[PDB]
């Protein structure tokens, strides 16, 4: 079975292709999931990209209705029926012949319903057989159809009536989980006939360019800021590498990643800082504190810094910002202060995904990243460090009645590291790397000897 | 499309404008969740700040009914009849047509709409579609941002009685009110706005007199005074005007001490200040106050010092934010305590908890405020599992030391964000006068967990 | 009862034969579980092996698009018409006359029913029963062993829709495809089977290429080297063949490390070997490797070594197990190795998990294939909760221990199943060559839970 792009990032990965070329597909989902966002997007593409001719059966929403709301994206559907592209047909035999001359009227390929369920109140027994018999006259014509029906429950039938997905061929799930008041997005496909794809939900979002699913090792070397912490490093990080500094409240994991950020744009180096704990305000004085003028940088355009609350959107959502404000930007390096804030209130399962998606897609455009987290046990894992190259590790050392701080490179993937907890202190100047506790034995929890 | 600003506060956030233009939107919730009201307030702010005629659909309530719930907040009945401002029609095609001639009777678009379910009693889905669906397309061709109102059975179930409603309207809006451990919590919730944009999940909201209060989601090196010395001189110079403080410790370490000490220096220096208390009453506060060398009385004489205590169990948690906020908008103190957030955190959820204290930080940070607030840490004589470490700029910790079978305490500056700070753990005692801070434990060591060596 | 073999890999274990001669067997499950598909194998491999003639009813779908659908696997229709093999009659007692007469005009007993419940529309329990249970009447007097598919609407629900169709059935087989943690498992389960024996509960299946691939649930003294001279010294003369070695530690240990050598081992001594990779990708394992003085690319270039990198979490534990297989069934490699299993049991119930480690042992112990998994301790610088080590017949643990401020690492035999070992803690390190076992810590004692004396 052939398959139709879509042209709906993240969704032709899934699909493996696309849709199935003759065959028709559901799109199940709640109210607000995305359904006619899928329906419209499912023609508009078709038409902006391949040049086929598609038709909108609407019901319960006008054809001007339909064009205002797609404006949301930049999208002018007028246009596109200006040229008799996109034939919006208003509004169970009358509708199929309805439906049938208008596809050869303008010789079409793609057609969307929206929705199906919408023409079923007068009519579970009748459903399915008027619902066969409507898919029996598309498949039979041999036009790819998006149709659209709609649920109750997230986890409950899959169409209204029990019978749509058994009499469909192709059925993909729109959700939109409310878990700890936040409203989650997933796509699903359940099924498709005849070929395959990937099972299981994906994180996807809505934004002003729609649908927005996401399903070398060069040996060279880059600075962290402080000199003594590239030769415990072993030369600096590397270019495509995650870092992750980890350590109590307190310690200096966001002095490092000012001075991480400040090193590139000391070498004309665009960088982003994503806070999610301090504002932008207390970012300035901090780092100005420790002698680094984030003010100047933001002046030549080397810096960016975008401050969020971790519970104000989802994980799929500041994801989205994130690769957004990546591929504006184009940094060289960027840092997520802290990872620690994106996991409180959120399903482990969400946030490795979340971490797999920001590495992941972190090395895939060539960015130095340096994740920070805060430990839960002050002056005392969840596998995230499984993920991360190099793990530079902050902790205090209760010292004569003296509470310091020491640092040691944990580890280094493919590359020589210094093995020594060196203790350090914090000035206005910025960290100051001194020498290993070599009396203080068994300082890996505190308590030394 | 463009937005409509409903001037209800929170939600012109949420919505990211208002409500759109010449669209029906739908408001679901159970028995009294706040429907009328927010159904009320789209109104009364409509002609009440944008001169913008609006009309309003009763059902089974009657219009003295309506006029005389809303005195509750202080909106009269005068735009009525009495101005030409208001219209509420008593109470399919017949109905429509009425709403459609009061539209262009008073010129308006602005209508609300309480309540629909009830007006398909003669009924039991597929003719609540045809009927509903018939009515939005009415209002729609006359343009008129309608307010539809229905009601609901389960806080988590179907989002209409129907399950229809929803699926009709652009907008759908769900008003919360679930009980989690005998405590109600009312959140709102955007569920989805054709054609445009929002923010995703519920809200935490109240009700009072002014209406619906939506709860959505620089930098100075001026210090100001702790209320002791030696604790300035261990901060660098002392805390940061805009910026939070906590104290973590045991109980019977010192909190409630220092955030004494803490008011005090404001009222001090002829500086307002609030004191929230959770833990002990007036009537104690004023008692131990006195017996370290502190005048609450005198305080609260100068009309520099205002306590507001009480049962961290009696009210939600965003009933206790509006309560700081009210205090804090009408006293505008220089600087507000909270002893203790641990107690506000008891038979709480762990998000319920965060949002809280993100309003309060947020809150405080954006009036210039600094913030002291105590935390009792679980360990007595033996972490911070909460994530709310992170949101403090300073930490003061005190911990009790056993030394020679005698209970003493110390106290060190955990942390100073954008300053330095002392780095010793120094023993403290408290007398008659307040806080004594000496020297530090040179000798015994690891008092991180107690019992040095 | 004797039992018709159905060819499906798996089936013919869970069912203690196959399906019973001459009865009824039903097969329910939501869809997009594979019911069509087993439906079509039964025939298929009825046909394409025993030469037993067989007829398909089809109802809802078309004999052209099931034509079509069933090419995915690489089935053609030439067996319809093209040679008499197969019947498809497009779609109660004229059916039930037509089927009757296409058995013996065939001459067969293999038939395949899908979908029942689709025949039902027209009415909405009793009558199902009534005209279901004539079916298997008819059925079973003609002595055709028939494979019925029924719809199900929940995976711990009803069998069927209408609560009924397994109580007529003789043999009732439920297809799950569960979803838990927004991972989809699929499942198959045999309820009963009148008359007979089975396999009770579910068990872990993928549909593929070949189709449908249930996963149901010597010993030599043959030594092979594990890459390093010191470590097969330390394990008595190195690892067993057909044995299972895991190398436990902590992040950044040298787990890694150790399993680019276990490999290297192979393609030096011309043998291949697969390296499951979890952690990491191929882009990253080449550089690392070179850093340690090991040419992955000549590996590769040697076609001695294969890597497959891929995402724990972007599918089912029973997809990564089918993938594990076809890879080994086709590169028949020496030796594999799996970095990481702890990474393949996060998001994972430690059901499926160790389901999924039996397999993969088991199939690595079947072919002779010496298997080296890997495992990162949830304690970093500071037990095993999983009960995955009695499985392993070696047990490398890796370990840190600071000295003197140093973050040192060691290594030891912790156990080695029918062969001596080495019993000390040697230390470590890592360098531009590899690993360099030295001796053990005399001095610092208690390096269990790490920190010594
Ligand atoms: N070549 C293939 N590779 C992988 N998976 C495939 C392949 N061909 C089919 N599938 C899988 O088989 C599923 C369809 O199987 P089948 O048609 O038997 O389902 P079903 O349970 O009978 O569906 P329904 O109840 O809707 O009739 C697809 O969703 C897909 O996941
Ligand atoms: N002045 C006030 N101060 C505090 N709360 C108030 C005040 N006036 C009204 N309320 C709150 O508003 C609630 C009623 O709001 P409203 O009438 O809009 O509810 P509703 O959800 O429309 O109810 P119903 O579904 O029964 O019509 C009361 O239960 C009360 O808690
Ligand atoms: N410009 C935009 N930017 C961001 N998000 C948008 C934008 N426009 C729409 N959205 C989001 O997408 C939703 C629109 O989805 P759509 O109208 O297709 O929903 P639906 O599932 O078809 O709803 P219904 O079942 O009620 O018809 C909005 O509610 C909003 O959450
Ligand atoms: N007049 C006094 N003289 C000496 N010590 C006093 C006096 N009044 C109080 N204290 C000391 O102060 C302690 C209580 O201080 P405070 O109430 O500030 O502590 P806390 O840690 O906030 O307590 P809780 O957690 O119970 O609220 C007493 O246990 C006692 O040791
Ligand atoms: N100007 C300064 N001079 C000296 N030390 C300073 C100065 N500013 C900050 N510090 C030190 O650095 C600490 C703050 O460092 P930083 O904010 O990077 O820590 P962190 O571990 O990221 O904290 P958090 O977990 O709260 O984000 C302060 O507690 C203090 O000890
Ligand atoms: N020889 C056997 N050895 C082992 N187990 C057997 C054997 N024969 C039958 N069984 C088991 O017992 C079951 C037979 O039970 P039985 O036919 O009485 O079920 P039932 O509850 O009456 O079913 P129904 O409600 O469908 O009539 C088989 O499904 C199988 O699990
Ligand atoms: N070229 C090199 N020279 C010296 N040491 C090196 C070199 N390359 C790597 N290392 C050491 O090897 C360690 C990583 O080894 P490896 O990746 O095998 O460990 P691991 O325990 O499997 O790690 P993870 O759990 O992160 O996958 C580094 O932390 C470093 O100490
Ligand atoms: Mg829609
Ligand atoms: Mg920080
Ligand atoms: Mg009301
Ligand atoms: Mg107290
Ligand atoms: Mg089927
Ligand atoms: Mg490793």
Redesign the pocket.
């Known amino acids: 079975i052939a398959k139709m792009r879509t042209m709906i990032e993240g969704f032709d990965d899934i699909s493996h292709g696309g849709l199935p070329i003759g065959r028709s597909t559901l799109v199940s989902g709640t109210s607000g999931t995305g359904k006619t966002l899928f329906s419209i997007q499912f023609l508009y593409n078709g038409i902006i990209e391949f040049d086929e001719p598609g038709v909108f059966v609407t019901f319960e929403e006008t054809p001007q209705d339909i064009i205002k709301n797609a404006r949301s994206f930049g999208w002018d559907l007028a246009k596109l029926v200006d040229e008799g592209k996109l034939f919006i047909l208003d509004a169970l035999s009358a509708l199929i012949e309805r439906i049938n001359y208008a596809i050869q009227k303008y010789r079409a390929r793609r057609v969307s319903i929206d929705s199906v369920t919408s023409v079923f109140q007068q009519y579970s027994s009748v459903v399915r057989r008027e619902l066969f018999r409507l898919v029996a006259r598309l498949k039979q014509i041999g036009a790819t159809t998006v149709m659209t029906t709609e649920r109750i429950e997230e986890y409950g039938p899959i169409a209204r009536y029990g019978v749509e997905?058994?009499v469909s061929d192709n059925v993909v799930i729109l959700r939109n989980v409310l878990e700890g008041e936040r409203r989650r997005r997933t796509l699903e496909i359940l099924?498709?006939?005849?070929?395959?794809?990937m099972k299981g939900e994906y994180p996807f979002t809505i934004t002003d360019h729609g649908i927005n699913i996401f399903p070398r090792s060069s040996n060279v070397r880059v600075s962290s800021g402080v000199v003594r912490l590239d030769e415990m490093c072993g030369g600096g990080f590397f270019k495509d590498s995650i870092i992750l500094a980890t350590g109590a409240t307190g310690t200096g994991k966001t002095l490092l990643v000012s001075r991480f950020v400040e090193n590139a744009c000391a070498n004309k180096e665009r960088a982003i800082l994503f806070a999610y704990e301090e504002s932008r305000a207390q970012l300035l004085r901090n780092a100005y504190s420790w002698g680094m003028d984030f003010e100047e940088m933001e002046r030549q355009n080397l810096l960016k810094i975008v401050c969020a609350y971790p519970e104000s959107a989802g994980l799929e959502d500041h994801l989205q910002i994130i690769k957004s404000e990546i591929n504006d930007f184009k940094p060289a390096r960027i840092a997520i202060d802290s990872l620690s804030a994106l996991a409180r209130g959120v399903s482990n399962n969400a946030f490795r995904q979340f971490v797999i998606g920001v590495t992941g897609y972190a090395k895939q455009e060539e960015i130095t990243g340096l994740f920070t987290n805060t430990s839960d046990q002050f002056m005392g894992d969840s596998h995230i460090t499984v993920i991360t190259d190099t793990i530079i590790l902050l902790q205090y050392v209760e010292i004569r009645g003296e509470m310091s701080r020491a640092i040691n490179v944990f580890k280094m993937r493919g590359s020589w590291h210094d093995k020594a907890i060196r203790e350090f202190m914090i000035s206005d100047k910025g960290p100051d790397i001194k020498d290993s506790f070599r009396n203080f034995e068994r300082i890996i929890s505190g308590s030394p000897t």
């Open positions: 997905e058994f099924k498709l006939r005849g070929t395959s794809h």
